[PDB]
Amino acid sequence: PSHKSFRTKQKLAKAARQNRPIPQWIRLRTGNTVH
Amino acid sequence: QRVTYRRRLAYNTRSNRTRIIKTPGNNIRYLHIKKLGTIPRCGDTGVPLQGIPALRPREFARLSHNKKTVQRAYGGCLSANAVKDRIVRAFLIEEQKIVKQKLKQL
Amino acid sequence: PRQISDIKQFLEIARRKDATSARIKKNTNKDVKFKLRCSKYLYTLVVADAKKAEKLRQSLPPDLTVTEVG
Amino acid sequence: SNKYIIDATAAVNDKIFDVAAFEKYLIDRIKVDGKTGNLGSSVVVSREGSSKIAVIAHIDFSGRYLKYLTKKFLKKHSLRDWLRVVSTKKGVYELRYY
RNA sequence: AAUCCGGUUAAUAUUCCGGAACCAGAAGGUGGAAUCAACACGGCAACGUAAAUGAAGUUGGAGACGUCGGCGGGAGCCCUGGGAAGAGUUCUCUUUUCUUUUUAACAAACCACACCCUGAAAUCGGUUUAUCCGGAGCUAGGGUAUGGUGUUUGGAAGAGUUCAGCGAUGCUGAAUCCGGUGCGCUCUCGACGGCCCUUGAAAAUCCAACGGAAGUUGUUUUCACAUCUGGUCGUACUCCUCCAAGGUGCCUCUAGUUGAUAGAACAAUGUAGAUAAGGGAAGUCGGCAAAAUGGGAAUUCCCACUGUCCCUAUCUACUAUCUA
């Protein structure tokens, strides 16, 4: 909805930003994983 | 043209009261008008009093004293007839008591 | 907005330190609308006599910022 | 009373229409009360000079009529592409090219 | 308690920009008002006004109250006469065809149901669309208040729109008008009349009254004006409920789509919809479905009707088929 608590805005933003491509240089430092 | 409500308070109710006006830009607009004021009512009889503007409760503070009361005993609280009835009844009761006390003392 | 018909009063309001700017409007009916901007109200004076408008114009204090047709 | 003037300076310069033509056509098409030549005293079409079409009327006479009537001969000669009628002023109508 | 208009974005607006307001609280100041006759005067009255102290204690009002019907008022929309502008149509006819023609919040002055005064009434008067009230004081006359509204402005043309041009998007012209209206639709207000019975929430909040504590320098002032401030959170976008044009179940304007995997062929099949000579329920357990209009008389009979049947035939779309 619209009348959303501010914690929800942080909660929604973090959940969405988890779906983000893992950087190329990240792989170059041995190993980094998903999920 | 079909017009939408300015607010987002869906399910229009008693509070949602609007007026259609034409703007200088040639647009029909909803203007929300607050409910009309209520004139004070007499305590004894209940008829609205005479000489008091019919405005909102919060608004009444802005008025001056003379604009909220009438220059008479119980002015702004009781009607003129109610005041007359109150005065004559009080005097007759007092006289009825004074004769009753006179009868008992003799 | 307040419409003022008393010219002297318009002068006194102008002399008041609250007044910031004044506007002169030339209408098609040859009226001059002296719109004086104050803190709370925009005081307008419509003068029908043309020479009255000019004699009004420099009687305004020089510190006040008068402006041409808006 | 009220006056209507149709400019014709451009027509005279470009020979699109001569003054005698506006004379003849306004006479035989002024449907004053539905009849041509019924102008009488109330309406007087007195064009002055070889550039003007002037009408003095004692009753209402919509300038929209004169535009419609001026469009008559304009279409007949088929110069509507090169010539149209506009309003310079209240009751004043003139002829524009491209 | 209190906000409107115009403009602005690729995407946000009653939030932003421009302009114009409003509310609430806060202090002093300025000016005005009242008093050693202690807290104002006027009017028969309803009540009026720039002000005109009010402790404790005691009350009253607003908030705050069902439903239905008709009438009246206003606004917007719809209808329409002209005026103007442009675009049409036009051999001729057609003063004609189509489209547009704006004023916000807010602030000013003025503009009509309850009550008062004179009055004493039936020969009953006044009066609703709907007979309601009147010695518990009618009609009539003069007032008081409530102003639903309307008038004139301000705001405000400087804005917006539409036409013409001339030259970063600027500049310059004009017009943006006068009506009429109706059981019209939408919304709201006033005045009634019923039905109630179920005689129709609460609180915050604001106001007033009774009450009379206290009190030359002062005291008060709910009067006018200036000055300041207004946090926190929601706001993008998607969709039980809102807005809902005209004309005669159809058509159209505004607006929105042209997407739903496509193409080619049209045999047989199936579905659907039709027409059919002569007969007319002979079909089947049977007038099931169609056409008739279904009808009449006691499930039956009579009459009518028809592809149900003899006996099927033809057409159409889709299906079905093949292709990507």
Side-chain angles (χ1 to χ4, degrees), chain D residues 6 11 16-18 21-26 28-29 53 66-80 83 85 95:
Chain D
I6 286 63
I16 314 298
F17 253 109
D18 63 12
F22 328 107
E23 298 271 344
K24 57 97 185 177
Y25 204 74
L26 271 297
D28 69 356
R29 311 312 307 91
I53 293 62
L66 298 301
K67 178 177 173 65
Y68 186 64
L69 298 213
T70 41
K71 285 146 54 179
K72 305 287 102 170
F73 42 73
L74 160 46
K75 166 157 275 292
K76 281 204 296 302
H77 294 53
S78 299
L79 278 85
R80 301 190 75 110
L83 175 275
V85 152
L95 52 154

Side-chain angles (χ1 to χ4, degrees), chain B residues 15-32:
Chain B
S15 159
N16 179 281
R17 281 177 58 243
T18 72
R19 186 265 305 266
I20 291 288
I21 206 62
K22 184 72 76 70
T23 60
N26 195 73
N27 280 314
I28 55 198
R29 293 263 175 85
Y30 278 131
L31 264 292
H32 304 257

Side-chain angles (χ1 to χ4, degrees), chain A:
Chain A
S2 328
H3 304 328
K4 318 189 270 168
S5 180
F6 165 64
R7 298 74 92 180
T8 309
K9 287 216 180 146
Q10 276 181 125
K11 286 287 304 180
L12 292 172
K14 183 192 234 142
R17 64 177 283 277
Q18 286 170 5
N19 296 118
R20 186 260 206 171
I22 313 184
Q24 186 54 186
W25 61 275
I26 262 336
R27 168 64 129 102
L28 296 185
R29 340 185 272 110
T30 309
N32 299 277
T33 86
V34 166
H35 274 182

Side-chain angles (χ1 to χ4, degrees), chain B:
Chain B
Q1 322 169 244
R2 279 82 68 84
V3 279
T4 62
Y5 277 160
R6 308 293 290 272
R7 288 92 184 275
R8 312 175 83 114
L9 197 145
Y11 312 89
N12 42 1
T13 61
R14 207 289 315 157
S15 159
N16 179 281
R17 281 177 58 243
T18 72
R19 186 265 305 266
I20 291 288
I21 206 62
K22 184 72 76 70
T23 60
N26 195 73
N27 280 314
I28 55 198
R29 293 263 175 85
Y30 278 131
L31 264 292
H32 304 257
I33 51 174
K34 332 290 190 156
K35 61 181 77 176
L36 206 53
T38 301
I39 183 161
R41 295 184 178 93
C42 171
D44 271 357
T45 80
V47 47
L49 293 105
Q50 185 184 1
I52 317 302
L55 301 167
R56 296 300 298 163
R58 169 58 86 158
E59 200 280 357
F60 278 159
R62 298 210 292 276
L63 291 168
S64 167
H65 196 63
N66 304 64
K67 275 60 190 169
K68 304 185 289 278
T69 187
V70 178
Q71 316 309 291
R72 184 171 15 86
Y74 299 77
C77 189
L78 294 183
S79 298
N81 295 350
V83 167
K84 162 198 262 313
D85 152 33
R86 181 77 66 83
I87 299 169
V88 317
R89 167 194 326 276
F91 175 67
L92 299 198
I93 285 182
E94 179 303 337
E95 215 65 353
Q96 271 158 24
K97 183 222 55 43
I98 211 186
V99 292
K100 266 37 217 173
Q101 89 77 38
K102 162 278 208 163
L103 285 186
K104 299 289 99 175
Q105 55 84 11
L106 60 85

Side-chain angles (χ1 to χ4, degrees), chain D residues 26-97:
Chain D
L26 271 297
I27 309 329
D28 69 356
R29 311 312 307 91
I30 42 173
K31 300 284 98 174
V32 179
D33 209 302
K35 282 81 64 181
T36 181
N38 204 147
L39 69 158
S41 71
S42 66
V43 168
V44 183
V45 52
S46 65
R47 312 172 200 72
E48 67 280 15
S50 190
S51 180
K52 300 281 98 173
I53 293 62
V55 162
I56 304 290
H58 299 350
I59 206 64
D60 64 310
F61 181 34
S62 53
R64 298 287 329 266
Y65 208 170
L66 298 301
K67 178 177 173 65
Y68 186 64
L69 298 213
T70 41
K71 285 146 54 179
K72 305 287 102 170
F73 42 73
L74 160 46
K75 166 157 275 292
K76 281 204 296 302
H77 294 53
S78 299
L79 278 85
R80 301 190 75 110
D81 165 326
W82 187 229
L83 175 275
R84 294 127 307 277
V85 152
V86 308
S87 47
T88 36
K89 195 253 289 180
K90 170 66 177 177
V92 192
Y93 308 66
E94 74 84 350
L95 52 154
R96 96 217 200 191
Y97 308 118

Side-chain angles (χ1 to χ4, degrees), chain C residues 20-38:
Chain C
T20 38
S21 72
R23 318 155 207 171
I24 292 91
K25 184 65 189 292
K26 291 295 294 182
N27 266 66
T28 69
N29 76 359
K30 306 306 101 176
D31 259 304
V32 169
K33 274 193 171 140
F34 284 96
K35 311 181 191 185
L36 182 62
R37 173 75 254 189
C38 281

